Homo-oligomer: A and B are copies of this chain.
Amino acid sequence: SIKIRDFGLGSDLISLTNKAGVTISFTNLGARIVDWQKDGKHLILGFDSAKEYLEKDAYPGATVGPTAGRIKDGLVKISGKDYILNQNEGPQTLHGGEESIHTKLWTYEVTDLGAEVQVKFSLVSNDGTNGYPGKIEMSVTHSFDDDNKWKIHYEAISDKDTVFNPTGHVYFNLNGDASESVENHGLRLAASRFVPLKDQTEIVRGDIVDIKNTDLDFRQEKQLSNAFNSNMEQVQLVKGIDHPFLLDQLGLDKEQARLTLDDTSISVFTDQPSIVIFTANFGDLGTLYHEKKQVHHGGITFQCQVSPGSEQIPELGDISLKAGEKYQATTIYSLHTKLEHHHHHH
């Protein structure tokens, strides 16, 4: 079933319940996921109204872009030309600049396919918005089906050569409580390399490093605590994880990551080459989620996209988008129960 109601400030909340009783909800403010529950338990982080997002943290569950991540000095090269984008983090352009797409009300239409329900959000980024050549006609379709798969499908076409590499900013916390650290979760991730950051500004260092057999190696499932407790330079730098991991094998058909807690698992599939993992390294900020003070490490993202830093590390990819060319990207998060045995204590 599908339900809709005002979510505040003119945004709406679209709630779907599939045949298995699982419910998931989205808002057109930032074409974002607001909640995902199983048996009354929140699987992700979210707020209860639109205003909270605007006042507390606008990123959670949002669609971010046009370019996700940081671009050093806000400088990109588009068809031999240098362009400077809005700089909202020091000289850096983070997540598309200020008052970006995650802060706008997108229009939308719901399509009921029975076993699947699609919520297609649309927005036009005008030419020159935040320094980006356009216009860019974007759409993000969020769908949920009877198989417990939440899929995000992105599409875009620009009138001019530009750059495009958006992502989905959901945070998971299988504890269903922000005040509980995700160090108790098990993580499997099919990636043998990562992109180190230069320093506190978080721009890329310039090299790609092999992480096999270090505390960041999750090719074989291990608890997140292993990473959090690590004193490896990079972990200490950011007080957790806040990095792009390069997938070893590409393709929508492969389970790239799996996050488990007891009997619940979330599997990640995508057609993108990297996954930026940020573990809510907010220290004592304590943003309130459902009246619970969020803890350091109280959430984890799996932002699938082309890795940030390609400006400096060309091997990472090319995010350019040619005029008239159709962009597409697909990321899927699937929920499972008793996929494996995970019985630990922390």
Residues of A at the B interface (CB closer than 8 Å) are 4, 6, 9-12, 28-29, 50, 86, 97-100, 103-109, 124, 126-132, 135
Picked from B12, B29, B97, the residue with its CB within 8 Å of the CB of A126 is: B97
Q: List 21 A-B contacts (CB under 8 A).
A: A4-B6, A6-B12, A9-B107, A9-B108, A10-B28, A10-B108, A28-B105, A29-B107, A50-B107, A98-B126, A99-B126, A103-B124, A104-B105, A105-B105, A105-B106, A105-B107, A126-B130, A128-B128, A128-B130, A128-B132, A129-B129
Residue of B nearest to A5 (CB): B6
A128 to B83, CA, bound (A): 12
Given contacts A4-B6, A106-B10, contact A86 B124 (CB under 8 A): no
Residue of B nearest to A131 (CB): B128
Question: Copy number in this complex?
Answer: 2
Picked from B97, B107, B124, B131, the residue with its CB within 8 Å of the CB of A10 is: B107
A255 CB to closest chain B CB (Å) equals 34
A103 to B135, CA, bound (A): 14
A129 to B99, CA, bound (A): 12
A117 CB to closest chain B CB (Å) equals 16
Additional 4 contacts, C-beta under 8 A, given A86-B126, A128-B131: A10-B28, A11-B107, A104-B105, A105-B107
Contacts of A12 in B (CB 8 A): 6, 10
A8 CB to closest chain B CB (Å) equals 9
